[PDB]
Amino acid sequence: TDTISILRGLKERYETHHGVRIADAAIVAAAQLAARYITQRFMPDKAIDLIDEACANTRVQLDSQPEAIDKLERRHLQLEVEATALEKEKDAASKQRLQEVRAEMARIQEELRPLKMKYESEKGRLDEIRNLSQRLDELKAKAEDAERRYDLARAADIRYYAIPDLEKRLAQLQAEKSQADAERADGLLAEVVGPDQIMEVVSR
Amino acid sequence: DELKAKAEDAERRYDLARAADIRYYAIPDLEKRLAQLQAEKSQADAERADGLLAEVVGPDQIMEVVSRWTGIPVSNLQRSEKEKLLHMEEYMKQHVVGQDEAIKAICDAIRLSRTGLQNRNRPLASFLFLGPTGCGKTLCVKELAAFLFNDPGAIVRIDMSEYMEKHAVSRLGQLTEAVRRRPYTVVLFDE
Amino acid sequence: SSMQFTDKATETLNAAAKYAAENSHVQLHPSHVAVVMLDEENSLFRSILEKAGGDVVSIERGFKKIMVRQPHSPELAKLLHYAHEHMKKQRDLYIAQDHLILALADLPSMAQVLKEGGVTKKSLENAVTHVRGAYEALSKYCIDLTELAASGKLDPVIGRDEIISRVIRVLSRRTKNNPCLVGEPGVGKTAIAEGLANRIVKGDIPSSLQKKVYSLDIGSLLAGAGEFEERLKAVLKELKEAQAIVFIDEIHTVLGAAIDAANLLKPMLARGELRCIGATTLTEYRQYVEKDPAFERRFQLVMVEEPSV
Amino acid sequence: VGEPGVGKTAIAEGLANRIVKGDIPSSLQKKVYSLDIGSLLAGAGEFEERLKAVLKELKEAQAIV
Amino acid sequence: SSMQFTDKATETLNAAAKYAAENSHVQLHPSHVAVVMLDEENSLFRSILEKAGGDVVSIERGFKKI
Amino acid sequence: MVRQPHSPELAKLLHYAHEHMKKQRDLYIAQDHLILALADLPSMAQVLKEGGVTKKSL
Ligand SMILES: Nc1ncnc2c1ncn2[C@@H]1O[C@H](COP(=O)(O)OP(=O)(O)O)[C@@H](O)[C@H]1O
Ligand SMILES: Nc1ncnc2c1ncn2[C@@H]1O[C@H](COP(=O)(O)OP(=O)(O)O)[C@@H](O)[C@H]1O
Ligand SMILES: Nc1ncnc2c1ncn2[C@@H]1O[C@H](COP(=O)(O)OP(=O)(O)O)[C@@H](O)[C@H]1O
Numbered sequence: 015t016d017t018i019s020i021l022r023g024l025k026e027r028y029e030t031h032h033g034v035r036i037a038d039a040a041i042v043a044a045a046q047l048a049a050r051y052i053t054q055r056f057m058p059d060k061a062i063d064l065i066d067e068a069c070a071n072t073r074v075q076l077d078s079q080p081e082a083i084d085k086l087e088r089r090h091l092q093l094e095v096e097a098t099a100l101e102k103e104k105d106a107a108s109k110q111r112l113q114e115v116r117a118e119m120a121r122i123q124e125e126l127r128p129l130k131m132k133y134e135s136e137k138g139r140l141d142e143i144r145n146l147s148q149r150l151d152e153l154k155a156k157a158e159d160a161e162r163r164y165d166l167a168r169a170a171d172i173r174y175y176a177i178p179d180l181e182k183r184l185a186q187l188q189a190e191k192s193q194a195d196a197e198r199a200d201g202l203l204a205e206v207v208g209p210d211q212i213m214e215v216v217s218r
Numbered sequence: 219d220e221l222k223a224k225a226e227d228a229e230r231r232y233d234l235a236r237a238a239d240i241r242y243y244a245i246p247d248l249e250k251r252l253a254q255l256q257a258e259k260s261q262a263d264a265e266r267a268d269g270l271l272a273e274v275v276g277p278d279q280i281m282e283v284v285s286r287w288t289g290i291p292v293s294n295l296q297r298s299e300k301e302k303l304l305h306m307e308e309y310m311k312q313h314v315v316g317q318d319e320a321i322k323a324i325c326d327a328i329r330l331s332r333t334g335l336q337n338r339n340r341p342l343a344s345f346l347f348l349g350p351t352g353c354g355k356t357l358c359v360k361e362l363a364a365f366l367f368n369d370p371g372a373i374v375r376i377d378m379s380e381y382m383e384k385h386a387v388s389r390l391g392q393l394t395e396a397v398r399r400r401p402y403t404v405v406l407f408d409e
Numbered sequence: 410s411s412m413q414f415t416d417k418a419t420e421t422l423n424a425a426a427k428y429a430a431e432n433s434h435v436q437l438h439p440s441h442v443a444v445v446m447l448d449e450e451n452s453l454f455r456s457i458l459e460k461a462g463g464d465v466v467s468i469e470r471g472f473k474k475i476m477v478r479q480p481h482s483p484e485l486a487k488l489l490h491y492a493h494e495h496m497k498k499q500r501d502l503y504i505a506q507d508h509l510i511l512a513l514a515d516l517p518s519m520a521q522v523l524k525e526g527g528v529t530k531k532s533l534e535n536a537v538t539h540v541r542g543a544y545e546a547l548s549k550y551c552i553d554l555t556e557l558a559a560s561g562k563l564d565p566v567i568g569r570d571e572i573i574s575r576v577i578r579v580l581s582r583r584t585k586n587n588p589c590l591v592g593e594p595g596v597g598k599t600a601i602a603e604g605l606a607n608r609i610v611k612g613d614i615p616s617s618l619q620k621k622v623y624s625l626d627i628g629s630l631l632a633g634a635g636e637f638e639e640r641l642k643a644v645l646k647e648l649k650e651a652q653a654i655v656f657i658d659e660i661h662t663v664l665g666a667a668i669d670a671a672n673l674l675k676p677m678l679a680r681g682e683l684r685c686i687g688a689t690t691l692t693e694y695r696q697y698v699e700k701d702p703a704f705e706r707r708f709q710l711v712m713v714e715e716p717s718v
Numbered sequence: 719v720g721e722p723g724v725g726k727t728a729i730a731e732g733l734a735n736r737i738v739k740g741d742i743p744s745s746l747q748k749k750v751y752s753l754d755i756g757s758l759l760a761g762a763g764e765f766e767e768r769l770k771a772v773l774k775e776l777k778e779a780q781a782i783v
Numbered sequence: 784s785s786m787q788f789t790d791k792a793t794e795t796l797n798a799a800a801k802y803a804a805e806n807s808h809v810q811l812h813p814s815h816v817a818v819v820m821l822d823e824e825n826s827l828f829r830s831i832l833e834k835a836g837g838d839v840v841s842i843e844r845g846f847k848k849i
Numbered sequence: 850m851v852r853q854p855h856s857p858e859l860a861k862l863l864h865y866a867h868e869h870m871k872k873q874r875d876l877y878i879a880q881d882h883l884i885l886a887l888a889d890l891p892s893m894a895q896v897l898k899e900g901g902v903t904k905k906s907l
Contacts, residue, residue, distance in 0.1 A: 031583045033617070056723025063585070070581035074574075077615035084613065099246050141616050162738065223561030230559045230610050410905065455824050460794060462802030462815075465822035466843060492873075497885055499872035508873050529805045534871055638761065672760035702722055 017045035020058045021065060030151050032069035033144035034076065035206045040065070043209040047216050068211045075204055077137055083129060090122045132198050139187060139194075146184045153177050221245060294368045302366060303329055313361050314354050324358075328366075363404045373404040412493040417545035417647075418504055421445060429476065436482040439516060440475045446506070450646065453506045453540070461536035463527025471522040484518055491515055507540060543623070544651065546643040550629045554622040554656065558606040566604030568716060569597075573604050575711065580654070580684060581617050585709040587678055589660070589687030591694050592713030598688040601713070602656050620654040620684065627663050630670075637668050645673060649682055660687040665697035678707050749781035795820045814849040862886060 021041045029036050048061045079087070097115040100108040153176050160169035195201035203210055221240050228237035263270060271278050281295040303325075310321045327343035330336055347355045364370045376393060380386065397403050425441035446454040447469060458465055491512055492504075502508065513519045514533050523529065528536070543553045557563050566573075572590075579588045590598050606622045608614050630640055648655055657663060664671040677683035687708065689697075698704045720726065734750050758768050776783055788796070798819045803811050821828055821843060832839050865886050870878070875885075887893045888907055897904070 028583070032581070056721050058725070059723045066582040066584065067578065070578045073581050073615045073617050074577065077617065078613055095241060099242050102242055103246055137616060226561040227559060410907075451824060455822065459819060459823055460798055462798040462805070462819050463822075464818050464847070467847070495872045497875050498869040499875050500877065501874065503874050511871060511873070527802060527806075532801060532805055535801075537871065669759060672756045675756035676754065 017048070017057050017061050018042055021045070021061065024062075026151065028065060028069065030144070030147040032066070032073060033140065033147070034069045034072045036065070036069065037206055037208050039208045040068070040212050043212050047212065051216055064212060064215055065207075068215050069207055071215075072205065072207060072211065076140055077133075079130065079133055083126075083133075086122065086126050087130060090119065090126060093119055093122075132194065136191075136194055139190065143184065143187055143191075146180060146187075150177060150180055150184070153180070288369075290368055297368075299332070303332065306365065309365050310358075310361060314358055317354050317358075320354070320358075324362075359404060359406055367402050367404065369402070372400055372402065373406060375406050375408060378407075378409040410493070410497075412496055413504075414492075415504055415545045416543050416548050417506070418509070420544075421509075432476070434476075434479055436479065437485055438476055438479055438482045439485050439488050439513065439519065440472045442509070443469075443472050443513065444476070446509075450650070454510065457507060457510060457536050457540050458528055460539060461528045461532035463523075463532065468522060468526040468528070471526055475518075475522070484516065487516065488512060502541070505545060507537065510537060544647040546640070546647055547623055550626055550640065550644060551655070552624045552626060554603065554624050555606045555609055558603065559610045563603055563607070564600070566600055566607070569601055569604050572601055572711075572713065573608070576601075576605060576686070577614065577618065579709055579711070581615065585707060586681065587685050587687065587708045588711050589689065589694075589698065589708045590713055591687075591689065591691050591711055593715070594690055596713055596715045598713065599658060602686055602688070620652055622686075623648070623653055623655045625655050625657045625663075627658070631668075637670070641670060641673050645677055645683070649677075654684040654686065656686045657688070659689055660685070661689040661693035661697045675703070679703075749779070751776070751781060751783045753783050812849065814846050818843065818846050858890065858892065861890070865889065 018041055021044065025036055025041070044064045045061050048057075048064060052060060052064070054060070078084075093115050097112060097119065100112045100115070153172050157169045157172040157177075160166075160172070191205075192201070195205070198204075221244050225237045225240040225245075228234070228240075259273070263273060281292055284290070285292050285295060306325055306328075307321060310324070311318075314321065324343070324345070327345070331340070331342055347358070349355075359373060360370060363373050374393075374396060381389070393405070397405065421442060422437065424445050426437050428445065429437065429441050443454065446452055455465060458468075495512070510533065514523070514530065520530065523533075543551065543556070547553070554563075576588045576590075580586055590601055592598050602622065609622070625644070630637070630644075644655075664674060674683070674685070678685060687698075698708055730750065737747055753772070758772075759765060761768075795816060799811065799815045802819060803815050817828070820826065823829075829839060832842060862883075866878075866882070869875075869882075869886070876882070885907065888897065888904055894904065897907070
């Protein structure tokens with residue numbers, strides 16, 4: 015019970031650095047599995063590492079692309095250069111191979127572009143979410159020192175004309191994120207750190 | 219090889235003006251000459267009726283390097299592991315006679331570990347030779363590495379004359395480090 | 410013949426043109442070089458002039474008034490020609506930050522401000538004598554792995570998909586952001602980091618990681634003298650303002666020891682301002698990392714298993 | 719005193735988050751310094767001379783370490 | 784009687800003699816020391832004027848007139 | 850050498866060595882130091898031009 019209260023205190027800072035969505039189900043499941051399976055260290059060192067490792071793995075799918083998508087993109091790059099190189103040649107054997115490369119690239123563009131561009135548009139939006147959390151957590155810390163060092167001309171421009179202005183931008187990006195998740199058949203585990211994400215770290 | 223390196227550097231440093239003349243001109247126009255010389259060279263080597271494996275690295279070329287860095291003849295390298303387990307009972311009887319009931323028991327403990335009828339938690343075969351002295355305890359070990367291991371000199375002998383004390387138990391370590399350099403070794407436990 | 414400039418001296422003219430671009434300018438004047446050098450951390454242009462005396466404030470304000478009167482400048486072409494002609498005159502020492510002071514003294518437009526400020530021409534001779542005896546230190550003492558990887562001069566890495574993907578997850582964490590390829594001298598340790606730099610240019614790395622890869626040469630830092638503190642502190646300073654990940658081959662030899670060199674890497678790896686990738690042997694790993702409890706807090710055990718058949 | 723895993727440095731971190739905010743009067747407020755053994759060993763012996771200057775400043779300024 | 788100097792104050796004293804000789808002077812006025820000492824990277828004298836009060840851009844202007 | 854009767858031209862050559870001691874990079878001030886110094890004189894660089902020695906290639 016004491017381990018759960020420790021992870022809840024640093025939940026705001028861990029969500030800022032990683033940038034994923036940390037839920038309440040991953041906190042209880044982390045302290046429960048750390049006292050039955052992985053048991054060789056001490057709390058909270060044997061419980062905090064289970065959260066930072068699970069949140070770091072989710073960052074790959076939220077920015078890069080899985081192996082099932084990256085493998086298809088590498089095959090299209092090798093066919094684009096080969097189709098152009100064989101076009102300049104006037105050999106009889108190059109004309110037959112050119113008809114098969116152009117017919118294969120038409121099927122790739124109909125399946126890779128509607129899937130790869132979804133992660134590209136999300137990358138430009140998900141990266142802005144982390145930039146908002148890094149600045150909102152910094153303004154709340156810089157304005158706190160002004161209240162203890164006798165400075166009213168500095169804290170008045172942060173708690174009023176900085177934090178309330180940058181807070182409305184975070185609420186607008188959360189509404190557009192749920193719309194893009196429906197077009198990718200993801201959202202229940204690909205961007206939410208829950209009990210299933212913590213169990214994958216212990217099992218490996 | 220150098221043109222492929224300069225072509226990839228221009229495409230990664232945002233320069234599509236120099237790499238367009240390498241991957242599309244300097245390379246497609248030179249692959250026909252390189253492939254033509256390799257085809258005419260392979261056809262001319264067959265007319266000489268000798269030196270067929272002197273230009274193409276094949277299975278016989280790799281066995282020549284291994285046979286030189288050790289001393290094992292070439293005839294022992296082409297023998298696969300499947301054919302050794304079949305003609306094993308006929309080779310042991312030519313050197314060790316009289317123990318007809320002991321040779322069959324050795325092959326019954328090795329064949330059950332190579333096919334896949336046992337878990338991967340035990341070594342090859344753990345034996346325990348007994349009987350009086352001079353019955354075939356040392357000669358049988360030397361004949362095992364001369365057929366299955368193809369190396370009679372790869373048999374270590376750790377006698378219990380100096381490792382009987384309790385202070386020498388941790389060096390079983392000298393035996394751990396010795397078997398790491400040579401995987402296929404024969405550890406003999408005398409006395 | 411041909412002149413050779415370092416990466417720090419090359420970016421000096423680029424950084425000077427960036428500051429002049431915001432003030433609406435079409436040419437690059439040599440006076441912008443002295444302004445950039447006076448806005449760095451622990452610069453050498455200030456300590457050298459302090460020995461000869463004079464007033465730097467009167468000189469700094471004089472150089473800032475020249476760039477305002479501005480409408481490649483004709484005066485800048487004489488500076489590049491002097492760097493090529495005087496490149497075979499003195500003795501040892503190549504080009505750096507202290508050698509650029511004598512190049513600006515030969516210009517008639519820059520010598521008038523110095524004489525009217527304090528430090529004359531004769532004072533500049535005795536000032537550079539006592540001080541005598543990728544960026545600048547990242548080119549001669551370090552080798553950028555991403556440069557050779559993008560130039561097609563790196564061997565392909567096939568068969569390390571289960572190891573490279575694990576290092577990316579370690580670098581994305583808040584704590585223990587210092588991987589250590591713990592293995593054996595024969596299973597492959599340097600070639601593992603070679604495949605990581607290939608995914609940086611291609612874009613397969615997540616957005617949370619955008620640094621570079623620099624191979625820290627141990628034998629290059631021990632070239633010559635005493636004078637090892639001036640070479641080790643110069644590498645750590647260039648990696649802090651540029652934000653890059655340095656690669657250290659065989660960390661058990663440089664971290665844990667003749668000349669004390671591991672003391673300059675402890676405060677950097679503790680504050681999160683440095684990311685190192687280790688690749689030592691398990692035999693020496695239990696005597697230089699697991700022995701000190703402070704080193705285990707920042708390094709994570711990464712086992713390297715030998716591939717099968 | 720405890721096992722290397724229960725937390726030692728984090729215990730001293732909570733002390734600075736209570737005296738600065740509000741707990742003890744200003745007559746007992748003392749600064750907390752983190753003396754690192756790697757910073758004094760660096761450089762040029764001269765290891766004992768750099769340590770004496772640190773212990774002298776901690777007395778006239780009234781602060782713990 | 785003995786006089787012992789350090790390192791930071793030693794380089795400043797030697798720099799004041801070179802500044803008074805390059806401008807053709809006779810006497811060594813004490814105003815030729817605070818100008819060279821102030822022109823230092825992270826100098827200890829800069830934090831003194833900023834702590835006890837007073838602008839650092841107006842005090843140095845009064846030393847050049849001497 | 851035939852037209853020959855310190856020197857008026859040697860005093861100018863010694864003036865270049867006084868400034869070349871504080872420059873950038875080279876070798877050791879000795880026999881090879883005066884090699885790259887005679888090319889600056891107009892009365893000595895004319896022979897190198899007609900013989901095939903470019904000032905930029907020196
Ligand atoms: N089956 C056999 N037929 C003939 N000679 C044998 C046989 N087995 C062993 N020997 C002889 O015994 C000798 C080795 O004896 P060894 O095995 O060392 O005795 P011990 O088992 O008492 O140590 C060899 O020189 C070999 O000629
Ligand atoms: N995936 C791979 N593909 C090709 N070569 C590899 C691969 N992994 C390792 N190697 C080879 O293993 C060698 C490892 O060298 P290095 O790590 O410097 O020292 P050590 O040999 O002691 O590990 C490299 O020279 C490299 O050629
Ligand atoms: N009450 C707590 N709340 C939040 N975090 C804690 C708490 N107690 C300990 N920690 C964390 O545990 C870690 C312990 O670090 P430290 O004691 O320096 O070394 P080690 O990790 O080896 O124990 C700290 O980084 C701290 O973030």
